[PDB]
Amino acid sequence: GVFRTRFTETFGVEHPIMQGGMQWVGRAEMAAAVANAGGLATLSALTQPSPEALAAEIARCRELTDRPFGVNLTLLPTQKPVPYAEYRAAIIEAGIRVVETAGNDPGEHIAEFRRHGVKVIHKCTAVRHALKAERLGVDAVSIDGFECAGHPGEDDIPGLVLLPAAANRLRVPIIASGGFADGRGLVAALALGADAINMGTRFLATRECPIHPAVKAAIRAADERSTDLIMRSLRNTARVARNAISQEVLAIEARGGAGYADIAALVSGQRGRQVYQQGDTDLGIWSAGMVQGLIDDEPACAELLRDIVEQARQLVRQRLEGMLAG
Amino acid sequence: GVFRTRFTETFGVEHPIMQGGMQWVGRAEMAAAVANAGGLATLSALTQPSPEALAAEIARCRELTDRPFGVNLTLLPTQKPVPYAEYRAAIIEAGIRVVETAGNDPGEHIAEFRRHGVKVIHKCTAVRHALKAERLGVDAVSIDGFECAGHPGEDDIPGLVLLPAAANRLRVPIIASGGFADGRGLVAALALGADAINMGTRFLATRECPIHPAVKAAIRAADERSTDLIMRSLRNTARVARNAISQEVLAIEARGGAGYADIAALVSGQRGRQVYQQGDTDLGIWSAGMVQGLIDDEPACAELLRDIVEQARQLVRQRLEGMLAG
């Protein structure tokens, strides 16, 4: 493609751009659009309610794209127990060649994927977690900074510092994640030591993303200050779109004594998944990054990836080289 | 020099690198080293205890450098009243050609500096504040992200998002501030739309910085997780080196009911200035950015600035161009 990096080489895709795990959203239509657009796409595993349904969704995604795509397997605190090993079995038996893991204690799942020729990208929120993942033999790490939609951990280190700190210590390829939307972010991430960018919020605002048009309009209208950090008091911080629910969750936490039971009904994924289906952005918790303040359009995935790498190339060849010319 | 930008052109310095205001530290020896090294240096105005002392310090700095330097005038909540207009008078009558203002309601001081041919750089923490500063006629804005040592405001927007959001709206040159230490940060900031970087913590860890060697060793030893955000409960957030004092201030705020009187003795500048003088990093509050986790050396200012721009040039010409070659 336009940029050749350790990422494009390692994972065999045209652009140094990845669409990581997106609960509820990361379905066949999203993954295929990204894969057809030249990026590394992922189907969300836990968006499918059983291993058998994930097998069916992998098959459906293969009807929409001939290009390889990955699966994201997320290992975070769960309301109901999850049979991870069976999901893992389904991913392997389907011939998926790359997996993005995220969350706590990925060790046992990384090893099993390795034993079967499945490359692993592990997403994590601190240099010490990336190093531990590298010791476990992952093929790349995704470094999730404080900007990110979702779970940034509890250190509160933005990518401007976390990426070069990770690059000072890691040897496997690095994917920068959180806060990225355009070619300026891609060049910044490459300069800081990454080999690719991961994006979540930016793909919400694409034509093919299978969510309600009112969610996409909320992202365009939102600025960078319109997210909340919920569950800080439970040390399970999650960055979410500011709405009546997240503001209520914050009000409950500010009273003191709040435990997860006091907010479980507000933060439930079954309320949150209706946001994307019906477009009622106050129905529940939905994930959005502060990068929404850089987003006000709705391109097709193919034009978006092409625009990012072309804009990034022009930043190098015109803006940066122009400052070195005189 | 190596990089020519709107910043180097507007302010007539060789490198797109600025040393901004540093209370207690920003004295003649610091400013002259940076000015002699090719950067935009500043003397701290409120580090001098009277306008007359600031005049004497400007004169002392002119014995150490023949290059122009600026003065920083900070407008933040003060324990004792400050005669800003008289400090302003002293800066003007000394023939200072550039000033960095910071803090709340800079309007009246910006105008007076303008009336006398003094260019103004205003440091601020949000796009709406930078726009208001631009409407007041400043010559450049300094965009201080969440990474920064000092006062980041209350929006908690890191530079990876705040810089491109500012660049989407501002027309005057942009200086990126907070989280920068080396050539990777310079290139990232230029890619994101800035024309220069401002640094604070990085200059603490230089040979010429006139602080106790044990403070410089604490910065080298510290990682990116070793800062605290004090006074969040007072909406006067300040990022400081983690130490016994800052941890105590956090413990007082966590009890509830805390007002500034309950912590004024712990956060006083007269305890904090002894940190730099005696090197007892637990004597008081001292400012340090999370970028300390990228810093483990102690160069001369001249070699440091030269290394940053040379490293930045090699990132463009070798790393970035190499990814575009194939």
Ligand SMILES: NC(=O)c1ccc[n+]([C@@H]2O[C@H](COP(=O)([O-])OP(=O)(O)OC[C@H]3O[C@@H](n4cnc5c(N)ncnc54)[C@H](O)[C@@H]3O)[C@@H](O)[C@H]2O)c1
């Ligand atoms: N942006 C993101 O990273 C993101 C978004 C959606 C879901 N997820 C994760 O994918 C998985 C399945 O999605 P879901 O929405 O149906 O799960 P869920 O219905 O359990 O969502 C509840 C939220 O509270 C958290 N939680 C659950 N049990 C908890 C406990 N005992 N203590 C503290 N926090 C607890 C969950 O992590 C989740 O964020 C979850 O693990 C969820 O965390 C991640």
Ligand SMILES: NC(=O)c1ccc[n+]([C@@H]2O[C@H](COP(=O)([O-])OP(=O)(O)OC[C@H]3O[C@@H](n4cnc5c(N)ncnc54)[C@H](O)[C@@H]3O)[C@@H](O)[C@H]2O)c1
């Ligand atoms: N890294 C930085 O940005 C930085 C570092 C040092 C000082 N300063 C500022 O330079 C000026 C002079 O330095 P100083 O240390 O001698 O001042 P100081 O002795 O008053 O320091 C006390 C700290 O508490 C704050 N404060 C003071 N009065 C307050 C009030 N009524 N309510 C809430 N907060 C209050 C101050 O801003 C300061 O951060 C101050 O305005 C200070 O804020 C900024």
Ligand SMILES: Cc1cc2nc3c(=O)[nH]c(=O)nc-3n(C[C@H](O)[C@H](O)[C@H](O)COP(=O)(O)O)c2cc1C
């Ligand atoms: C709606 C949505 C759902 C997400 N679901 C998951 C998930 O299930 N597991 C996970 O590891 N990350 C999840 N993420 C995080 C993304 O994979 C990615 O790390 C993050 O969006 C990067 O930050 P950005 O939004 O600024 O691009 C989700 C993000 C969004 C916006």
Ligand SMILES: Cc1cc2nc3c(=O)[nH]c(=O)nc-3n(C[C@H](O)[C@H](O)[C@H](O)COP(=O)(O)O)c2cc1C
């Ligand atoms: C010791 C120290 C003192 C500072 N004093 C001031 C000050 O008086 N006024 C101000 O506007 N900024 C002050 N700053 C902030 C710097 O000017 C600069 O904005 C900040 O350090 C940028 O973040 P960085 O440390 O990551 O480079 C200070 C920073 C440090 C480290």
